[PDB]
């Protein structure tokens, strides 16, 4: 159980977006919480790196989210689910608590160890990930 992104991984911030390969111990991110769906600024305690040949590619709303096999999403009306166990057509939330929809589900080895990044976050235990702000756990 893997929990990370590969390098270009979009991450929504105070002042637009970031890459996951670009965020710093101390550096910010929107987190959304999920008993609530209060928005909120939060700050990153630290910035984990792997690697891994094993990926999972997932479709949300037309964005790509390359991602690991084990990785938390947060499903509308169910709560937090494995990105590999999810299936097309199933709802997930944005940034906003907004439903959406799974457009495809993929899945590779690798010919090289690539990789991949993860960090935690100040109080909060939530962020973003991609251009649709898809809505996952730390």
Same mark, same amino acid.
């Given at each position: 159980?893997?929990?990370?992104?590969?390098?270009?991984?979009?991450?929504?911030?105070?002042?637009?977006?970031?890459?996951?390969?670009?965020?710093?111990?101390?550096?910010?991110?929107?987190?959304?919480?999920?008993?609530?769906?209060?928005?909120?600024?939060?700050?990153?305690?630290?910035?984990?790196?792997?690697?891994?040949?094993?990926?999972?590619?997932?479709?949300?709303?037309?964005?790509?989210?390359?991602?690991?096999?084990?990785?938390?999403?947060?499903?509308?009306? =169910?709560?937090? @689910? %494995?990105?590999? #166990? /999810?299936?097309?057509? &199933? *709802?997930?939330?944005?940034?906003?608590?907004? =439903?959406?929809? @799974? %457009?495809?589900? #993929? /899945?590779?080895?690798? &010919? *090289?160890?690539?990789?991949?990044?993860?960090?935690?976050?100040?109080?909060?235990?939530?962020?973003?990930?991609?251009?649709?702000?898809?809505?996952?756990?730390?």
């Amino acid at each position: 159980s893997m929990k990370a992104f590969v390098a270009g991984t979009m991450i929504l911030t105070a002042t637009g977006l970031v890459a996951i390969e670009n965020i710093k111990a101390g550096d910010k991110v929107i987190a959304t919480n999920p008993e609530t769906f209060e928005v909120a600024e939060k700050t990153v305690l630290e910035t984990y790196v792997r690697e891994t040949t094993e990926l999972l590619h997932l479709t949300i709303g037309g964005e790509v989210i390359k991602t690991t096999f084990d990785h938390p999403f947060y499903v509308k009306d =169910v709560g937090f @689910v %494995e990105a590999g #166990k /999810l299936q097309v057509g &199933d *709802k997930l939330l944005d940034s906003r608590g907004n =439903v959406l929809v @799974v %457009e495809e589900k #993929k /899945l590779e080895i690798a &010919d *090289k160890p690539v990789k991949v990044y993860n960090f935690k976050v100040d109080d909060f235990h939530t962020y973003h990930v991609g251009d649709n702000e898809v809505l996952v756990h730390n």
